Design an enzyme around this catalytic site. Structure first.
Site, short mmCIF file in Angstrom:
data_model
loop_
_atom_site.label_atom_id
_atom_site.label_comp_id
_atom_site.label_asym_id
_atom_site.label_seq_id
_atom_site.Cartn_x
_atom_site.Cartn_y
_atom_site.Cartn_z
N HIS A 45 0.81 -1.21 0.00
CA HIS A 45 0.00 0.00 0.00
C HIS A 45 0.85 1.26 0.00
O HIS A 45 0.32 2.38 -0.11
CB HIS A 45 -1.00 0.02 1.17
CG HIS A 45 -0.41 0.36 2.50
ND1 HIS A 45 -0.14 -0.60 3.46
CD2 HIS A 45 -0.09 1.55 3.06
CE1 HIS A 45 0.32 -0.01 4.55
NE2 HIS A 45 0.35 1.30 4.34
N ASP A 89 -0.20 -7.52 1.41
CA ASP A 89 0.28 -6.14 1.46
C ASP A 89 1.80 -6.17 1.54
O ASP A 89 2.39 -5.82 2.55
CB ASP A 89 -0.31 -5.44 2.69
CG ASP A 89 -0.01 -3.96 2.72
OD1 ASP A 89 0.44 -3.41 1.69
OD2 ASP A 89 -0.22 -3.34 3.78
N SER A 182 4.22 1.63 8.44
CA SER A 182 4.00 0.62 7.40
C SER A 182 5.29 0.25 6.66
O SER A 182 6.11 1.11 6.34
CB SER A 182 2.97 1.13 6.39
OG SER A 182 1.68 1.24 6.99
C1 LIG Z 1 0.35 0.83 10.02
C2 LIG Z 1 -0.87 1.09 10.89
C3 LIG Z 1 -0.83 0.59 12.22
C4 LIG Z 1 -1.92 0.79 13.10
C5 LIG Z 1 -3.06 1.48 12.65
C6 LIG Z 1 -3.14 1.98 11.34
S1 LIG Z 1 -4.43 2.84 10.66
C7 LIG Z 1 -3.67 3.01 9.16
C8 LIG Z 1 -2.38 2.43 9.10
C9 LIG Z 1 -1.50 2.47 7.84
N1 LIG Z 1 -2.12 2.94 6.59
C10 LIG Z 1 -2.22 4.27 6.23
O1 LIG Z 1 -1.80 5.18 6.92
N2 LIG Z 1 -2.85 4.41 5.02
C11 LIG Z 1 -3.14 5.68 4.32
C12 LIG Z 1 -4.49 6.29 4.75
C13 LIG Z 1 -4.34 7.72 5.31
C14 LIG Z 1 -5.68 8.36 5.75
O2 LIG Z 1 -6.75 7.81 5.48
O3 LIG Z 1 -5.62 9.42 6.38
C15 LIG Z 1 -3.16 3.18 4.58
C16 LIG Z 1 -3.84 2.65 3.35
C17 LIG Z 1 -3.99 1.29 3.24
C18 LIG Z 1 -3.51 0.32 4.28
C19 LIG Z 1 -2.88 0.74 5.43
C20 LIG Z 1 -2.68 2.22 5.62
C21 LIG Z 1 -2.03 1.80 10.41
#
Ligand SMILES: Cc1cccc2scc(Cn3c(=O)n(CCCC(=O)O)c4ccccc43)c12
Ligand SMILES: *[C@@H]1O[C@H](CO)[C@@H](O)[C@H](O)[C@H]1NC(C)=O
Ligand SMILES: *[C@@H]1O[C@H](CO)[C@@H](O)[C@H](O)[C@H]1NC(C)=O
Ligand SMILES: [Zn+2]
EC number: 3.4.21.39
Length: 226
Positions: A45, A89, A182
């Protein structure tokens, strides 16, 4: 990283700081890790129009000699990566040139050992991600020790699959990988077992990590054909 501690500068030489560029938006940032002098493993991603990899960094706001800003020639996103389920992913980044080996930059031995299952309940993950829900990405590399959980702990993530992913982070604690982390490696006993993938926007652990063992054949294929 939430609830972690600043890493000893350059103590994790394989860590990669990625800056991802897109056509209609500001650059984004993710983690990753060097597995070959010209290959960085990260999350699918994190793909974009173009990507720049910075190796040998600690405080990414201050450039230093240890830094190696490297061009990515091609992005190998897993063929089965799915944006709705987030399965598979994983992505390999081929660097235009082979990185230099220094005290601050080195590859993470991979593959290592031999297990279909990641031993040990306590692992560690590092990154430059946000340190809280309303907190910005950390200037310095942070690391935290997390508990590998039984799959049941991640049941609420409806698309979580025990065969393809790892459930990481005791829900009773705040410690966890978060946005910006990530692509980072989950190390258990020193070996990379997973890759930071996703979790809850409210940061409540556990989080979902890509289970590396499942992709060994795909990874070797890509590294072999390039
Ligand atoms: C890596 C991780 C650990 C714990 C909780 C969470 S919540 C999102 C993530 C990582 N993460 C992310 O920040 N985006 C952008 C969206 C930005 C947006 O929508 O503002 C992602 C899009 C697809 C999958 C994972 C994503 C994460
Ligand atoms: C990183 O370096 C900047 C200077 O460019 C400094 O302001 C910041 O405090 C440093 N990060 C930490 C917390 O060490
Ligand atoms: C992603 O997986 C879903 C199944 O939940 C499927 O309906 C969808 O077509 C897939 N998307 C892709 C990548 O084709
Ligand atoms: Zn330094």
């Amino acid at each position: 990283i939430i609830g972690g501690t600043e890493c000893k500068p350059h103590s994790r030489p394989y860590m990669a700081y990625l800056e991802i560029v897109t056509s209609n938006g500001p650059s984004k940032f993710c983690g990753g890790f060097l597995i070959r002098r010209n290959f960085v493993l990260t999350a699918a991603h994190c793909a974009g129009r173009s990507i720049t990899v910075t190796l040998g960094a600690h405080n990414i706001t201050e450039e230093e000699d240890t830094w190696q800003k490297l061009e990515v020639i091609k992005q190998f996103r897993h063929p089965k990566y799915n944006t709705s389920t987030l399965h598979h992913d994983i992505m390999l980044l081929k660097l235009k040139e082979k990185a230099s080996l220094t005290l601050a930059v080195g590859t993470l031995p991979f593959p290592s050992q031999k297990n279909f299952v990641p031993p040990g309940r306590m692992c560690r993950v590092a990154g430059w991600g946000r340190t809280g829900v309303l907190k910005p990405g950390s200037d310095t590399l942070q690391e935290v020790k997390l508990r590998l959980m039984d799959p049941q702990a991640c049941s609420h993530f409806r698309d979580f699959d025990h065969n393809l992913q790892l459930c990481v982070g005791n829900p009773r604690k705040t410690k966890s990988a978060f946005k910006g982390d990530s692509g980072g490696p989950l190390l258990c006993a020193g070996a990379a077992q997973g890759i930071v993938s996703y979790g809850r926007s409210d940061a409540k652990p556990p989080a979902v990590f890509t289970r590396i063992s499942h992709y060994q054949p795909w990874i070797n294929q890509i590294l072999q054909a390039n």
